[PDB]
Ligand binder design. Sequence first.
Ligand SMILES: Nc1nc2c([nH]c(=O)n2[C@@H]2O[C@H](COP(=O)(O)OP(=O)(O)O)[C@@H](O)[C@H]2O)c(=O)[nH]1
Ligand SMILES: Nc1nc2c([nH]c(=O)n2[C@@H]2O[C@H](COP(=O)(O)O)[C@@H](O)[C@H]2O)c(=O)[nH]1
Ligand SMILES: [Mg+2]
Length: 292
Amino acid sequence: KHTVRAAGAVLWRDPATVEVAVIHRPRYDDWSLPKGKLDQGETEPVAAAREIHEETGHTAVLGRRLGRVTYPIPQGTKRVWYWAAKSTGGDFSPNDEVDKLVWLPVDAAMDQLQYPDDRKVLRRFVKRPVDTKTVLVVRHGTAGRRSRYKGDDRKRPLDKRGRAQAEALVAQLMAFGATTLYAADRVRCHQTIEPLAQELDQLIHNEPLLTEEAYAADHKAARKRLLEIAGRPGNPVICTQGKVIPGLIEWWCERAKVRPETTGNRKGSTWVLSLSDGELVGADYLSPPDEK
Ligand SMILES: Nc1nc2c([nH]c(=O)n2[C@@H]2O[C@H](COP(=O)(O)OP(=O)(O)O)[C@@H](O)[C@H]2O)c(=O)[nH]1
Ligand SMILES: Nc1nc2c([nH]c(=O)n2[C@@H]2O[C@H](COP(=O)(O)O)[C@@H](O)[C@H]2O)c(=O)[nH]1
Ligand SMILES: [Mg+2]
């Protein structure tokens, strides 16, 4: 430490036929990618989306994560996680902070980008498909402690913290354009995604096949259910339990030969599974919204 947390993006619009946005900032006279520090209570994806909008005028849908860049600054170390971000429209107007934005194909953007780490990010971007759909696998938020009773406490609810995580997850799941909601047949799973359900005004599909008991009883039915959900149109959120997620994630990653750059399994965490034509092309583990 001290680590100053930030996030940014390769903002793109219509493989390597797309155009990407490169910005110019007067204060530093640099050509780079949009990025900015996280505000109080923001996560990286929420900050990336916000900074794309504030600097370029565009709204966007985040997809694949593109790695991390660190460099020293007087306060310590700046850390920047980057996402591919598909433009959903907007218009750039110059300001004091960013006076120019150019939309360039990857090759010319490579030439325009002055920092080696930005070119490294853009190399990662072109490495895989960027027109992806997304499956968000979420482990439910904190819900106190398991009781002494055998098995699972079906009705045990989120605790105060878990409720806050559920609220903070709305903005992070919307940053990836979540559209449809699923939770394992436990109260704490449904409660984690209820604030998002309110915000989209949508129903949560119940998933008894994805509880810990059912995964332990019939792991192949769970796996098959996950792929059925993934196959539906739209970007599903699936909220389940700690003994389920690692095994489903490691199975999908191993069969699609996809390497996660980070890994964890914390309550309130999210896995961002990027799909192109049904093949897994990214698996990005995001910390709980109130952890680093
Ligand atoms: N945007 C960007 N700036 C970088 C990088 N590396 C790097 O050393 N810098 C420099 O870091 C300094 C601080 O820039 P930064 O954008 O991190 O600061 P701020 O959040 O705008 O205050 C500037 O002089 C940049 O030229 C980089 O990869 N991207
Ligand atoms: N504006 C600017 N451009 C720089 C710098 N360094 C640096 O390598 N370049 C590159 O110089 C080219 C553009 O110069 P201008 O048109 O003068 O902004 C781009 O290739 C940038 O990547 C720099 O500090 N300022
Ligand atoms: Mg910035």
